[PDB]
Amino acid sequence: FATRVISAPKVTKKVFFKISINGEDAGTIKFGLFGDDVPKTAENFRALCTGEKGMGKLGKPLHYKGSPFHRVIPNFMIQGGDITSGNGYGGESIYGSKFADESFKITHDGPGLLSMANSGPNTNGSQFFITTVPCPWLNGKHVVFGKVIEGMEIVKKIESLGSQSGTPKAKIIIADCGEITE
Numbered sequence: 001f002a003t004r005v006i007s008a009p010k011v012t013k014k015v016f017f018k019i020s021i022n023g024e025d026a027g028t029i030k031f032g033l034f035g036d037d038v039p040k041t042a043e044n045f046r047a048l049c050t051g052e053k054g055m056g057k058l059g060k061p062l063h064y065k066g067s068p069f070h071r072v073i074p075n076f077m078i079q080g081g082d083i084t085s086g087n088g089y090g091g092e093s094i095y096g097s098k099f100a101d102e103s104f105k106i107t108h109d110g111p112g113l114l115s116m117a118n119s120g121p122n123t124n125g126s127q128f129f130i131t132t133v134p135c136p137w138l139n140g141k142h143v144v145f146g147k148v149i150e151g152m153e154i155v156k157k158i159e160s161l162g163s164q165s166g167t168p169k170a171k172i173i174i175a176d177c178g179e180i181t182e
Contacts, residue, residue: 008147009034009036009037009106010034010036010037011032011033011034011146011147011149012032012033012034012035012036012039012042013032013033013035013042013046013179013180014030014031014032014033014149014179014180014182015030015031015033015045015046015049015177015178015179015180016028016029016030016031016049016177016178016180017029017031017049017064017174017176017177018174018175018176018177019154019158019172019173019174019175020171020172020173020175021157021158021161021170021171021172021173022170022171023171025175026154026157026158026172027151027153027154027157028150028151028154029148029150029151029152029154029155030148030149030150030151030180031045031114031146031147031148031149032146032147032149033045033046033114033145033146034106034144034145034146034147037103037105037106037145038102038103038106038143038144038145039102040095040099040102041102041116041124041143041145042145042146043094044093044094044095044099044124044126045114045128045145045146046179047062047094048062048063048064048081048083048094048126048177049064049177049178049179050063050177050178050179051063051064051065053094056083056084056092056094057092057096057097058084058090058092059084060083060084060092061083062083062092062094062126063083063177064081064083064126064174064177065174065175065176065177066083066086066173066174066175067080067081067082067083067086067126067173067174068080068082068086068168068171068172068173068174069158069168069172069173069174070082070086070087070088070168071088071166071167071168072158072159072161072162072163072166072168072172073159073162073163073164073166074132074159074160074162074163074164075132075133076131076132076133076135077129077130077131077132077133077135078129078130078132078155078158078159078162078172079117079127079128079129079130079166080127080128080129080172080174081117081125081126081127081128082126082127083126084126088127090125091117091125091126091127092125092126093124093125093126098118098122098123098124098125099122099124100121100122100124101116101118101121101122101124101143102143102145103143104139104140104141104143106143106144106145107136107139107144108131108134108135108136108137108138108139108142108144109134109136110131110133110134111131111132111133111134111152111155112130112131112132112147112148112152112155113130113131113135113144113146113147113148114128114129114130114144114145114146114147114148115128115129115130115131115138115142115143115144115145116128116129116142116143116145117129117142118141118142124143129142130148130155132155132156132159158172
């Protein structure tokens with residue numbers, strides 16, 4: 001019954017983003033979430049791709065659709081998921097408030113990892129980032145909970161529209177998002 005030998009956590013659920021860059025379709029990015037290892041963090045992110053939880057305490061949809069990549073730093077990461085004020089300071093989780101860091105056991109070992117942006121311990125909302133390099137120094141501070149499984153070429157593309165200050169050089173949007181039931 002045991003069939004393969006993974007050097008990584010198991011992908012429990014799959015979700016996707018569809019990226020628009022300056023109003024133009026830029027492709028899809030597929031993610032696998034580590035629901036066995038960080039379930040509350042994977043579930044939060046998944047229901048934000050569906051919008052299934054409706055309207056948050058802050059008067060916006062609990063829904064990634066329409067949020068920008070508000071901070072893009074080359075040779076580091078791309079970041080978005082501000083679903084309330086949409087400017088990089090907002091964000092809201094599906095748990096009413098910021099929830100605690102689930103686990104620091106999946107580390108920032110290479111590019112293409114999904115991780116929770118925060119403002120300190122137990123401040124996880126909806127802001128995420130995708131690494132584009134190994135970030136061992138974020139270990140113990142940001143909860144890794146998923147990875148890019150298709151479309152890293154597009155993560156690489158959004159990164160190239162960044163700056164070292166991190167201000168984006170184009171309007172990068174999650175034009176649509178959902179779950180891959182299959």
